[PDB]
From a paper:
Potyviral CP plays a role in virtually every step of the viral infection cycle, from transmission of the virion by aphids, virus assembly and disassembly, regulation of genome amplification, protein translation, to cell-to-cell and long-distance movement. CP consists of a highly conserved globular core flanked by two large extended regions with a high frequency of structural disorder. The C-terminal high intrinsic disorder region (C-IDR) is partially conserved and packaged in the lumen of the virion, supported by the helical ssRNA scaffold. Here, we show that we can control the shape, size, RNA encapsidation ability, symmetry, stability and surface functionalization of nanoparticles through structure-based design of CP from [name] Y ([name]).
SEC analysis of the P-side mutants trCPK176C, trCPK176S, and trCPK177E indicated the formation of larger particles than double rings. Cryo-EM 2D class averages showed that most of these particles had a cubic shape. 3D reconstruction of trCPK176C with an overall resolution of 3.0 Å revealed the cubes consisted of six orthogonally arranged rings, with no additional stacking of rings as found in trCPE150C. The center of each octameric ring contained a blob of density, which disappeared after removal of the His6-tags (trCPK176C-noHis) without affecting the cubic architecture. Another blob of density was observed in the center of all cubic assemblies, indicating the presence of putative cargo. We measured masses of ~1.3 MDa for each, a mass higher than expected based on 48 copies of the protomers and consistent with a central cargo of approximately 250–350 kDa. Although we cannot assess at this point how important the central protein mass is for self-assembly, our results clearly indicate that no molecular species other than the subunits of trCP mutant are required for the formation of these cubic particles. In summary, the cubic assemblies of selected P-side trCP mutants are composed exclusively of CP-derived units. 48 surface exposed C-termini can be modified to carry (removable) affinity tags such as His6-tag or Spy-tag.
Numbering used by the authors:
A (entry chain Aa), D (entry chain Al): 53 to 222
B (entry chain Ah), C (entry chain Am), E (entry chain Ao): 55 to 222
Write the structure that this text describes.
């Protein structure tokens, strides 16, 4: 029979709750930073950039698209750019990386679902393979919604996509 | 040729005939009960939690160590979900007091972890992240996809081969 | 062509779009909650047992009705094992108060019965006697081998074929 | 997710005990009479036969071997015989059948394990196919330990034996 | 799992090991000795014959019931040949006192009937009329061609198949 864990003759697990405890893999995964680590980061960039509680969403839109075509391991001393119409708005990367615990990739993994959605609509007008796949010989175009560094391989990910990431990685 | 010292065996074949310890109680792949109790009673004190809800916390920790592993960052935190909310706990007591290794201390959950990784496969496919990261493509072996599994004589040969594949 | 009486639909498509009842809550293959509560609260009174140990009795009854069936002899007794000892209970409250049929009242255990018929297959092969009497030779379908299983949209086609084989 | 049974918001099952409740199939099966129904029968035959608390075992040995070679549905008005050396000791069947609840087959199913053991040793000297298989064209000799009316098909029974019983039955 | 009532087996395995009754003494296909004696001592009285010549009469009756059968007309007569002459006897005592059935009472002659149906095959072919009427075309199975044969573990498979052919 199964040998349930016991300390001093008492099961150390609650079975009424284990049967009804089905966490989504992403919530307890370690490829994504905790929402308590995202909130600290998010608020930190609002403080460094002096952007108000409004307009931050639009700065996060530039970073998301910027982090798809550039990567989530940039230089702490550089500047990421977002297009304000036709011009170029450069922001410092120090708050982005200095306050990204444990790493920016895990902080940016919160955008994974939106990231693939953004690529599809972009790909729904003309070809758009994110640079993370162009500099890694990702040639199939259908698997272009998974060509970004901060993608979270979950139980719902196509197996191909999973194999492709094994290819882009090294 | 029975062992002997001074014209007397140094064994009792009466006892032995009926001495049959299960492999998971003699094996070193799993911490001793005295070690498990010490770890459990130290995590209980370090978390300011009583017996009323400590078992509930252990449900989350097991489910975390199925999806993350038994070699985490000591200066970190393990996550539990209280519904849609997130519950964060330190990993200092978990790793500091888990002698010899947290895997040996978590090997006591091998049977329950096996149940919960198939109890969540019913209804919908589910696969731990110790198999999704280690390139496992067979759902029938999802039961055995966690670091602290106890390989015994009852393990399927196919299961005992996924582990050497995932472990390398 | 939407139904109508007097120039007005007799339906609300707003509601409907988001009205999605699970099949095992609308289906008649399973007794209603008000019927389950009446049966449970009648068996509890007819057995001189409180909430402290009534759940324990229900563990035995489910395991009996997996191995015997849901059409027993009303003037009989269902057996429970308190270790090596035998515990005998009447089947008058079980069948008398189970409206409409005990199978509908036992259909609420279809999910748990499925778990327990696979939770006892781990470790050692196990097969209910509603499959050993109805000529079933495949252990992979042992989960679905009990009278009060609830056939839903999630039932495997192979499982949904064993039942029509066992049911005839 | 699994929908555990509930009455008024409380599970009607104890999960700490269900995981550790693995009854042997025979103990809760209905092909075997309850030990409370065997004890009543057993004691009844001791009262009808006037045999003491000793010597009943030897009368149960004749009935077991008699019920292998004859059947467990005899005439209530007959007499079953056991061999006392070379002679023939006839006993009335009224207490055997009148006090066999629900039926003698279920009362005699308590001897199933011994019954097959008895045949093997009998078959370990010379061929012995119980009459229940001779009058039913049971031709294979290895499956002669399952040729008796009160056999309990369990999870440990060979599948052949199971198919054979389907053949002897009708 | 030995049977038991109150923590004591209800069997003696000492005795059993050496309890080995022949099948034709426990089987119900053949009348008990007390029944045979009652029938024999009733036919003896109903025929006004002593022990001096009763065995001779039984020689004819066995040879009749090999050629006619064990289900005759009670209000009839069975024939014996005293050379070229005919000897007629009633069948009232034969059938009336043969409990439970005359076949069970005549099963005691299965061994002798087998001898006499082969002892008359030596020299010249001979076949009972329970085989000539039931379409049997093999002389090697003439031994087993009578109603009151006792099918035992020693019966040839071919012989045990003629009977089911002749019996249908």
């Amino acid at each position: 029979k199964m040998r349930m864990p016991k300390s001093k003759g008492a099961t150390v697990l609650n079975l009424e709750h284990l049967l009804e405890y089905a966490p989504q893999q992403i919530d307890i995964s370690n490829t994504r930073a905790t929402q308590s680590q995202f909130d600290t980061w998010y608020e930190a960039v609002q403080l460094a950039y002096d952007i108000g509680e409004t307009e931050m969403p639009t700065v996060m839109n530039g970073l998301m698209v910027w982090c798809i075509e550039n990567g989530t391991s940039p230089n702490i001393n550089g500047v990421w750019v977002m297009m304000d119409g036709d011009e170029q708005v450069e922001y410092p990367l120090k708050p982005i990386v200095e306050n990204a615990k444990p790493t920016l990739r895990q902080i940016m993994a919160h955008f994974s679902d939106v990231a693939e959605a953004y690529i599809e609509m972009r790909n729904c007008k003309e070809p758009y393979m994110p640079r993370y796949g162009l500099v890694r010989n990702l040639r199939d175009g259908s698997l272009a919604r998974y060509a970004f560094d901060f993608y979270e391989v979950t139980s719902r990910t196509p197996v191909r996509a999973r194999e492709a990431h094994i290819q882009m990685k090294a």
